[PDB]
Amino acid sequence: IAKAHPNFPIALQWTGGRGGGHHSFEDAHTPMLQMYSKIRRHPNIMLIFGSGFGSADDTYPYLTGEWSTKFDYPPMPFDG
Amino acid sequence: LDFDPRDVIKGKDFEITAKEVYDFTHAVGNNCEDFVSRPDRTMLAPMDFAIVVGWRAIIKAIFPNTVDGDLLKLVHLSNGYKMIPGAKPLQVGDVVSTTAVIESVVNQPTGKIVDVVGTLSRNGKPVMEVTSSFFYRGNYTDFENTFQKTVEPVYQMHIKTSKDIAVLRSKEWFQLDDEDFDLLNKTLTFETETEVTFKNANIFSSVKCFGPIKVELPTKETVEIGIVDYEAGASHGNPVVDFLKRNGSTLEQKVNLENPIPIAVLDSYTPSTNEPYARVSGDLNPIHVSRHFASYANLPGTITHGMFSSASVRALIENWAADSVSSRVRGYTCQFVDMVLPNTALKTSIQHVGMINGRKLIKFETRNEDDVVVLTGEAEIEQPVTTFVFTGQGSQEQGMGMDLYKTSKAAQDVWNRADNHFKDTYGFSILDIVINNPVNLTIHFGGEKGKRIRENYSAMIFETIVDGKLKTEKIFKEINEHSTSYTFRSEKGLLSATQFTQPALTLMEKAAFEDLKSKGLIPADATFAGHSLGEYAALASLADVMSIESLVEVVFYRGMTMQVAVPRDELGRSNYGMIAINPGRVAASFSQEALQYVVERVGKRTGWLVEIVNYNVENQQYVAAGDLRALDTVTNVLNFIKLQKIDIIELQKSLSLEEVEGHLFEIIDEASKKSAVKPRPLKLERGFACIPLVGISVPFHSTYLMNGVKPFKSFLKKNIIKENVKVARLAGKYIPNLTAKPFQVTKEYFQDVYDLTGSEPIKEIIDNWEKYEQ
Amino acid sequence: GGQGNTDDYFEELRDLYQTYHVLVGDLIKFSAETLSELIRTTLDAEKVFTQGLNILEWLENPSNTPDKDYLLSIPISCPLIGVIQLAHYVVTAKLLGFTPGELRSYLKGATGHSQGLVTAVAIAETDSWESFFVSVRKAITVLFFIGVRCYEAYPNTSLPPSILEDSLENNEGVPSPMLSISNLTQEQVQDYVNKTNSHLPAGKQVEISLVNGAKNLVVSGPPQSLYGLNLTLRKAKAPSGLDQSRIPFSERKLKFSNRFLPVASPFHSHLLVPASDLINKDLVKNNVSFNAKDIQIPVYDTFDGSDLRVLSGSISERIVDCIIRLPVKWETTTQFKATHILDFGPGGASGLGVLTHRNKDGTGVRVIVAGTLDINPDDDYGFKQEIFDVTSNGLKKNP
Amino acid sequence: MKPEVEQELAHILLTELLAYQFASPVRWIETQDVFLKDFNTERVVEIGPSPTLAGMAQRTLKNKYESYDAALSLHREILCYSKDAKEIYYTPDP
């Protein structure tokens, strides 16, 4: 989509089955952990990450990429 | 050149070095990554490398002055190696002593041929043999020092009449150790060798034909009886064989497969030169590296060494036909046809055709770039490490094998010889049993034969170990000198009766096996065993311990003795039986000792008989037998504890290993009477874990039957013979079901069997074992 | 770039003798000639090189070229890899008028994969265009003797087709002394090999040879043993087209690919230890010896990732011990800091820099291809031209 | 040793083995193991009318000898005279 419409923003409210309501199987991290790059090659993507947040402490890493560290990955901070 | 063409040639001891083979191989193309590994190890060498050491002797035979010819137009016509059976391949540390002798030198019109044979030995043991066939083409008339010698196709003579044994005894070369012998219904084999000195291409001048004459036994284990010794002069042929061609037949150990099957059509490349080989083999023939001879030879040029081609193709094969193991190859020959030149590529075909002595028979054919043939031959290559198992009772069914009994002469020759013998001894053919399982079989004791047979039935005894008494006890009690008949009953059908299952199973199996043997699918190093019944079929098949007839006599005696030791109801139903068990189902934790803790308890508590009699597969299969009123109760407790999944393992490990005793006593003394109120005609079931065994109602292979062996053991000592037996086919290859260890003649084997059976022969032997010291 | 990245490395020389002939002929001549000289001066190498090593005439007419099983082998190939790398170095140093010394001066450091390492340290001593062929010799000799003293320490042996064919339908190819595993860690395979070895003896035992990534690993051993491992993996496969989309994460089967590399001998194993000593002689038999003072830039140990100037004694010793006996922690060595990377190594498109990027993606580092002139749409890395661009187009920066 | 005294001794051993083959349970576990592991067979043939040992095979092999059989490139093959007639006669057509 983005590649097809480069200038229109696009928000990915990525989220894992661990979120209420409808409930995927995939884990929250791994597909992010392995597609963040493929994403950032398109600046029209505003990234957002849910599925299990209720505070600042619970998400700040996701804001500063720290999470990807423990998985031996470059920090991958999220846009929202 | 005063070599005696008739004498032997002595080579010289040659030690092997990992360097020389590493040189050879690369001089060849034998990249089989098996012949070489880390140095400093005993690495194994190639069959072909034998040439390397036989050469310096193989050809001292063709130099002699009596054998005149020009080494230039000389030709290598063929070459073969035969790794003699039982001898391993060869290694680096293996020093060798070679020997060579010319078998035959014939004088064709087109020149003169020689066929030489070399034999190699390590430590005095022969290791392999080698045949070679050259040709001093041209023209020669020196028949005086010409001769020939060969082995013949072992002939088979099947004797049915009596006017033939006379024409035989009419003979002068058909002499024996004792003319007394009986030569009717006997089968003879003639492994004769012929020698001959010529004076013309056809008109002989001296003829020897010698060789043993052997006889079939009821085991068909041939044995020597007499000797042929035919002597003659001025012959024009060989009679000793002509009287066998039409009279007898050709026991062609070979057999062609039904539908040929190609393996591959590969390609290789000659070297660019021929010097490396020439250095390795010691074959310094200029004909392959120098050009100022090949032109002296009216040749194309510096051709390859044909033997290089032999080795190239043999290694081309080993990888493909033997998946790159060499020890398998035990025979390989090749026939050179025409010659080739370096830097040449080939279409070498491969094709599985025949079988011999349980090993495969391949042919090859090397086509050129013009797709013309140069090499052709064959290879005797072992089969994988092979194993034959034989079933037990429970697999029977109708038509079993009779589909085959119409097909393989080798199997009908068995079923007949068996039934015909029964009919003549006990009065029933199974070929009217298997085809139509009847419910009842009545036996008539008619005239003389009838009496013969009714006593055959009453001449047997259920000896039984009580008081130490070899209790002379009657097998058939309704029988008597005043009787005239008898009846066997089996509500489903007598094939459901161990009385008659055992023998038919043994038949079917033995028959299949001897069909195979007719097809040469059985090695000598193969293994064999059976499951509680196939042991006898296996013994016969592999080792031919005994005939078909004594075999089946005793299997019948056995089926009965199994039958007798339990009292039965109206038709033959009793209160004992057996059951199969899968620990895995009751619990994935259900160990082998779980079966113990669950069976010993029922046994002690109900005082009834239940005992694991076959260790089939661990944690997955164990079969027990004994009192049904206790066996199905053990079934009940298992079907209860699985729906409870009380892991007797978690009992041993959660409880001290003795409070478990009272806990299981409670469980089981409850479940028994919960389950012991069954009626007399007890029915068996698969609940959760255990499975019944119907057709079976006797708990054999448990101590309850220890008493019925001396009867047996004695019958055995009667039927079989220490002569027919041959350890050669037992050591390592037989694995008893009693002793799961391979049959071996040792104190430790004897004590392994004894300490668990506790019988006098073992102990008296190990006491007198020193007879071993002759 | 080391060994085990492509199938036709020799064709990668075509261009250099076809394209850059004017610029690399003298060098390749020097190399091939010193090589034949080694073949002769040495005692027995004349055997292993069955079809010889006259390479120059393998160029003008590929017909004169042997095939892989004689051309893909180590004692015939490894030096050719080294020289390919050296040529991809010289062409640039020239196109910039940079003498080797001048060029080296520009870098923070260097390093190499399984074998390329030597080439790297080679550079570290180059100063001129005439003090060059000396180092060329110093390295090409090392590769020659390595490939040789190995090929006999563990040669190739034809494999029973009973495997060859099954491995094909099994999604694999011709076995080889080393196998690559994807999507899987270093502990799982360690367990698997502990098992597979428990059944087997040392002389057939295997071991992890290369920690390429953190999930892209490589092990070494007898093709037989490696195929056995392959099957005790087939036990655990999960064909990528299985669509486990409808089963939770933890309840899924580990799917991953794996295959043999076009290699001819098991580097970084115990099998080849016996040859190590043998070569430390063949070198001092010659005059080859590397020194810290002579290297101006640091190079790092594929094993420790530490510098070599800093080292107890001889260097070439630690070098070889890292090529044959020890594995490579491509990350422990790549712990350095930079902005740009470029592999003269073979493969290029499939070369080492690719997977390095695959590890060095979110770290703010840019890799290129100094061996091929081609295009990557995503421009996640670059190629040769991206080196010479004097414009801002050349100084491209992934994030 | 002396072939003949040994012939006799073997005749005996065999005799009593077959005799007490009546009550002593069958150590099929140990056999199924030894001849499968100490001799590394490639072909086991269930001569019989119904394939059961085959069922008893590839059920102890897989269950206990999978790591082992893969460790060493084993094409362990199990056949029955009931069904595997061409895998045993070597008479298959394409």
Numbering used by the authors:
A (entry chain G): 719 to 798
B (entry chain G): 1277 to 2050
C (entry chain G): 161 to 559
D (entry chain A): 1 to 94
Show passages lifted from the paper.
Type I fungal FAS forms a barrel-shaped complex composed of two reaction chambers. Six β-chains form the walls of the barrel while a central wheel, made by the six α-chains, bisects the barrel into two chemically identical reaction chambers. Therefore, each chamber has three complete sets of catalytic domains including three acyl-carrier protein (ACP) domains. Substrates are shuttled between the static reaction centers by the mobile ACP domain flexibly tethered at its N and C termini.
We used cryoEM to reconstruct ab initio ACP densities inside the reaction chambers of endogenous fungal FASs from S. cerevisiae and the opportunistic pathogen Candida albicans in the Apo and KS-stalled state, at 12 Å resolution, allowing localization of densities corresponding to this mobile domain. In the Apo state, ACP density is strongest in proximity of the KS domain in S. cerevisiae FAS and allows for a complete tracing of its backbone atoms in the high resolution cryoEM map. Examining the surface electrostatics of ACP- KS- and ER-domains shows a strong surface charge complementarity between the structural lobe of ACP with the KS domain in S. cerevisiae. In S. cerevisiae FAS, second strongest ACP density is observed at lower resolution and less stringent threshold of the AAI map that shows ACP near the apical region of the reaction chamber and facing the AT catalytic site. In both FASs in the Apo state, the structural lobe of ACP has stronger and better resolved densities compared to the canonical lobe in the KS-binding site, as observed in the high-resolution refined maps, suggesting a more stable interaction between the former and the KS-domain in the absence of substrates. Interestingly, in the S. cerevisiae Apo and KS-stalled states, where no ACP density can be seen by the ER domain, the catalytic histidine side chain is in a single conformation facing FMN.
